[PDB]
Structure formats: C-alpha cells, structure tokens
Amino acid sequence: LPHGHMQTLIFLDLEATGLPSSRPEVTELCLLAVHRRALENPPPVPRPPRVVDKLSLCVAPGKACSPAASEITGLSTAVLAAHGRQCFDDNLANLLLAFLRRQPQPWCLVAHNGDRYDFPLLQAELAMLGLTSALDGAFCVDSITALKALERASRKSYSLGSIYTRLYGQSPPDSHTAEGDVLALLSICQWRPQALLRWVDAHARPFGTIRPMYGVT
Amino acid sequence: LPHGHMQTLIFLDLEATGLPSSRPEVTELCLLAVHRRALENPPPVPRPPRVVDKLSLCVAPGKACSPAASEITGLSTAVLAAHGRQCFDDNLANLLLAFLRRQPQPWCLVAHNGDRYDFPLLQAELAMLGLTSALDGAFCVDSITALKALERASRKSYSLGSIYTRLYGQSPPDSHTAEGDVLALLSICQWRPQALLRWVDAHARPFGTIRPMYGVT
C-alpha cells in the first residue's frame, strides 16, 4: 500500500456553472465522511451508516450558469443570489479543512469522475484564492475507475445512474443535487465494501498531484 | 422588531449522553441553514427548499451514554470511538462559526425545546472550551414556543412528533437522529411560513443571553 490504509472516505460531489472548457465555478458541494469501520461488515439498496459526517453547501459563482447547468442542477446565479449565497472564499476553504480535520487520517476523497471534474475543479477554486496546498494532506480516488475494476473483477456505462440502476434496479432518488449524488455514490460503494477498500488503499492518490482545472499550478 | 428581520434560520438539533441534570455532552449535531427567501411563498409534507446549507456531525463525548440515550439515538461512546469521532474541541467551534459565516445575518437558531436543552447545552460545550462568546452574533428561538403560538392563533402535546403527526398525518421519518429531527422541524415550520417568520422576528433572542447548562457563565 503506497500510503497505508485509508481511515476515512469522504464522498464528494461538485456542481458547477458548466463544463471544464468553460472555466466553470462551483455552485454546490457535498462532503460525506464515512469512517472505514462503517464499510467493514434485485438486492436492496444498502442503508447508510448511522455514524456519518455530512456537509452540503451552495456557492454563489462569479458568473452565470449555463442553461444546461441550471436545467440539470436546478440552480442559477440569480436563485443563489436570492438566497444570499456567498462566493468561494477563504472562509469556505477554512470550513472544508475544519470538516476534514474532524476525520481520522489518512483522508481519501471519493468522487465519480473526480479525476476529470470534481478534483481539478476544487483545486482550481483553491488556486484562485492562493490556497494551493490547503487540502494537500488528503488523498483521492475516482470511483469511476474503482467501480470499473470491481464490476470487471466480478459494453456498460459507468455513470452514476447506470451503475446504481444496474446494481439495485432503480434510479437514485435526488439526481444532480450534490447531496443526492453523494448518497447514491455511497450506496454503490456499499455494494462490495471490502473489495472497494482494497482498491482504494492501493490507488489512493495525493490530492496535491491533482492539477487544477484552471489557475496557477 | 427588536433586532430587525432575521435573514437566515438555522434549524438545530443536539443529541447528547443524557438529560440536563446529568451534565450531558453532545454526541451528534445538525445545522440546516435556510434563507428567509425559501420561507416566503391531510396536506402533503412540504418539500425542503432547493437551496439549503447542511452540517451534520457526530461527536465523541468525554463520558458514557446513558442506556436511554443509546436506545433513543442509536449512538454510544463505544460506537463513536469505533468510528474515530473527535471530542468537542476548538476545531469544531471554528467549524460551526465558519458554517454560520456562510449565511446572511441576522442569524436565528431554531431548535425544538431549544431554550431548555439545545441552546444551554451548546453554550455549555463552548463554555468548557473558554469560547464563551463564540456564537454571540447569532439569535435563537424555541420552536416549541413558536408552534404553540401559531396553532393557538389558528390539551395537545407540542413535541416534535405530536405536531408533525397532527399536521401531516404521519410520523417523521428518521426520529431521534440529529438530521432527521432537523428535517422534521423544517417541515413543520413550513406549515405556515409567513406566520412563523413574523413570530421569529418578534421573539428573536440574542444567543449570548442563553445561560449555559453547566460551566462558567
């Protein structure tokens, strides 16, 4: 194991104003911290663990949401401003780090398509604030890569809804809201928990090696 | 209005090791921040607003949970320790304040039986850390007093489950978990949202006037 056994899996999802090439900005985020103990034990959807830490926040972006983004997430810059949401700032970064500091280390962020979207976007927002190494103590894995390895070890789509529906026979409840996507990802990761933990431990990647989607590197 | 219109209602619930006379310690907490805009519009349960901030955390108490507490909340000091939960510390207090700083002011904490339990207990945990004025910028109301005034304005129990069942014809889903109790309280406060906001604005009480359940005053 490159960095030992991960103690806490922090399932993560970011919603934003658009796609990577549009220089997107976070509109919503959810972090759900689950200790390794909770993952050490047609079918029914597994129940979430009793002991979990959860953080869900809406963020006012510095730009307009694309029509597709508002259609998908139900959020817009006007709606976020009507609720007095604040931009991505130092206080938000301090909040995220304080949330992670509640969790036993090593931390491992888990996000669906995180290597291409969630992780670079989070690094980009931190880079704009000059907090380039704020979350360097954490590790991260992409659950798309994880679930591909698990299912193939025993063509399919490996989107969040495709895997969820393929395993449990129904679509996840609250699709394309940060918390709903995190809870659906947790349910899928509870399918084969021990096999997931083995894969996460072997593929845990330092968050500092994640290049930001934009901004200084 | 004593302190103007409240901008953000932060629904709050604390779970602990026991009753006030036992010097209880927090085992779980949930904060759900809802801007006033979201409350400005047999019956079905109202849907929660799209734009909400949520924080749910489990806390390792410095003592054992009473059998009744573990029976009710599903938590115990051993279970919390098995998941590596940390005690109520400076980092947790910084986290709570950073969460509130995401919300437009004035802040108004809302808790069922908060005047007798949730508010004094939170003040007690902060007082043990010497952070006696950490949340002094916030206001607070007890939703038991609020819902009594609303229903009487048009003998009943005014417990969370009694009001919820009386209004919506069923019991709340996740009873006696911090997040479940907060979501049930939100649904009840959405019954007559405009009347609730009028009552909250007139009865908003500075959190600094809340005496701690124990510790230095």
Residue numbers in the entry:
A (entry chain A), B (entry chain A): 6 to 46, 54 to 166, 174 to 236
What did the publication describing this PDB structure actually write?
TREX1 is a cytosolic DNA nuclease essential for regulation of cGAS-STING immune signaling. Human TREX1 is a 3′-to-5′ exonuclease composed of an N-terminal DNase catalytic domain (amino acids 1–242) and an unstructured C-terminus (amino acids 243–314) implicated in membrane targeting. Loss of TREX1 function results in accumulation of cytosolic DNA, inappropriate activation of cGAS-STING signaling, and severe autoimmunity. The overall structure of hTREX1 adopts the homodimeric conformation previously defined for mTREX1 with enzymatic active sites on opposite outer faces of the dimer.
Reasoning that reduced thermal stability and poor crystal packing may explain the lack of structural information for hTREX1, we screened each hTREX1 chimera for the ability for form protein crystals. We identified conditions for the growth of hTREX1 Chi 2, Chi 3.1, Chi 4.1, and Chi 5.1 crystals and determined three crystal structures (hTREX1 Chi 3.1, Chi 4.1, and Chi 5.1).
